[PDB]
Write a protein that binds this DNA or RNA. Structure first.
Lengths: 59, 140, 103
RNA sequence: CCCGGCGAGGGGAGUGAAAAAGAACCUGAAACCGUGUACGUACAAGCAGUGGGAGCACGCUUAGGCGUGUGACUGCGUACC
RNA sequence: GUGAAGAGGGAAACAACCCAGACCGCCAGCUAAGGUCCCAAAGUCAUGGUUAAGUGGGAAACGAUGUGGGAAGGCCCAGAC
RNA sequence: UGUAACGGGGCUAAACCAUGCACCGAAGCUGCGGCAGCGACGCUUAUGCGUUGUUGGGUAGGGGAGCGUUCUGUAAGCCUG
RNA sequence: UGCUGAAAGCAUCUAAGCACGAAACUUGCCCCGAGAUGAGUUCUCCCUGACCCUUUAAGGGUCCUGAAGGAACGUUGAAGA
């Protein structure tokens, strides 16, 4: 349920749950994505930006 | 305050022409379950009570990719264990849209529980653009 | 205001809720202690530039108010299966919450 | 007093605190039952569940997620000695 | 090795038999050993071979102009096939 | 005596072996509550509350501690038609 | 059973490909069938007067020169549990 909102559309962008998470966890302040990412269910239209932050090296 | 989402009856149905029929059949007949439940529409109740409406188009194209196709049987013996048996195989039975060679979800919701109310919501009308007997409003 | 509190409680990221914490080892029934232990609380969680976590600490502290959870709510189960017969036994604990952030 | 079989039992009177003391004389639940407020419901599985919850016969609230039970979905299982 | 007067997660559903493992709580975190497309809740990820048979969850006494990786060797352009 | 050796459905590579990586994740140690036993501490000591260590399934045996329909008694004592 | 014809200038029903074939599998055969609750439908025949009640898409409720009709309607019977 809660992770649905960070994979159903993010799939077609290639940002695949299990395989994104190694990239993300390289940053020691970004740990608790478990429940705190669920705002993504309504936040879509300005949540689109979130993955720009480190993309140069992340992607 | 709850994280749960019952009924939901059925709030997300995603009306889709399953064109994957034959040309990558045994990849996505395995996961028509996880579609009715999930992978896009997973955002509400991905385990309990729900319904879906996927759009059928052809049936006798199973493709299936192995020696299995011309020597794997199916059995029902519907009365008194049958006695006298049956021995037709997969590309010979698929000629008929029946109950075992065409739904797939038979084997993935595999007993009847949770499946007991969602048998023909996908219509199983078969015969291409000549047989679009599905939803009049705009399917994807 | 959007707490950073997690010990026995990390659901609590809501601004008021209501949602539970711990009743801790020592006095937890006294209402208030009026002092404020935290300020790493939030930043983009409250503004027109959005983030899902703790990047900042925006001027708004959290008061020490463990509140008045004094009537004994529901706590206990038992033991039986085979001959395992314990039907009092259960030494107590409970949960409680904050007095309502006046900010 | 009134009906019925010149009956049985009740509906009011009534000695009476009382007929929940009425002569199948005990001030009084138990094995099992009848009409009903609403449930679940003539595709049934597996000690018939406590969960987790939709809204339903009904009830309180200057709106405030509760006070109520058969128990759509299904999850967990084998309560004994 | 603690077996039941020990219950149920192990290795298949061989309660005992490898052994340390539970009082009792959560709309909270995760440890191994089974796995990890599934009923089933995470990559059709990246990075190297093999394999082209339905091979995997049936081997023992042999077989065979189908191929696969390696190091020596024989024969051959004064002409071996 | 109904195809019934993973529980299925057999998957042509999703695999089979080697090399990278992070998710699931029994009651299994963690969040932080409460605390019976035998020990060590700060002191107290009729003794106890917390700190600190060992740790909290329980038919053979020995420790050692809670309460009743009311009888014989606390009490012409206070309680109640 | 053999056709072309190779793997390997051979020999050749197979390798790539064909054409037939039997209690046999199938199959509008013979016999019932969504009582297979997937709940599908053709063909042919038949109903259009006034209105009320709020807690409204949930419905609840009336009254129309009483229509053509319906089963007990008088014996049964051919099937009669």
């Amino acid at each position: 349920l809660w992770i649905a909102r960070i994979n159903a559309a993010a799939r077609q962008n290639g940002i695949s749950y299990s395989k994104f998470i190694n990239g993300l966890k390289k940053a020691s302040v970004e740990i608790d994505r478990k429940i705190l990412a669920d705002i993504a269910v309504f936040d879509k239209v300005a949540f689109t930006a979130l993955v720009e932050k480190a993309k140069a090296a992340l992607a | 305050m709850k994280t749960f989402t019952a009924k939901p009856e059925t709030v997300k149905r995603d009306w889709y022409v399953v064109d994957a029929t034959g040309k990558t059949l045994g990849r996505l007949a395995t996961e028509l379950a996880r579609r009715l439940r999930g992978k896009h529409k997973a955002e509400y109740t991905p385990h309990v009570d729900t319904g879906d409406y996927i759009i059928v188009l052809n049936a006798d194209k199973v493709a299936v990719t192995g020696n299995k196709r011309t020597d794997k049987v199916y059995y029902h013996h519907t009365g008194h264990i049958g006695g006298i048996k049956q021995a037709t195989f997969e590309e010979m039975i698929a000629r008929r849209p029946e109950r075992v060679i065409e739904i797939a979800v038979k084997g993935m919701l595999p007993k009847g529980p949770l499946g007991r109310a969602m048998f023909r919501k996908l219509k199983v009308y078969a015969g291409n653009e000549h047989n679009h007997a599905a939803q009049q409003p705009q399917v994807l | 205001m959007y707490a950073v509190f997690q010990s026995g409680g990390k659901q609590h990221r809501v601004s008021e809720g209501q949602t539970v914490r711990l009743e801790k080892l020592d006095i937890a029934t006294g209402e208030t202690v009026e002092f404020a232990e935290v300020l790493m609380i939030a930043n983009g969680e409250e503004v027109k530039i959005g983030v899902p976590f703790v990047d900042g600490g925006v001027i708004k502290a959290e008061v020490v108010a463990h509140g008045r959870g004094e009537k004994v709510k529901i706590v206990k189960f038992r033991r039986r299966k085979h001959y395992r017969k314990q039907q009092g036994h259960r030494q107590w604990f409970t949960d409680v919450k904050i007095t309502g952030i006046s900010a």
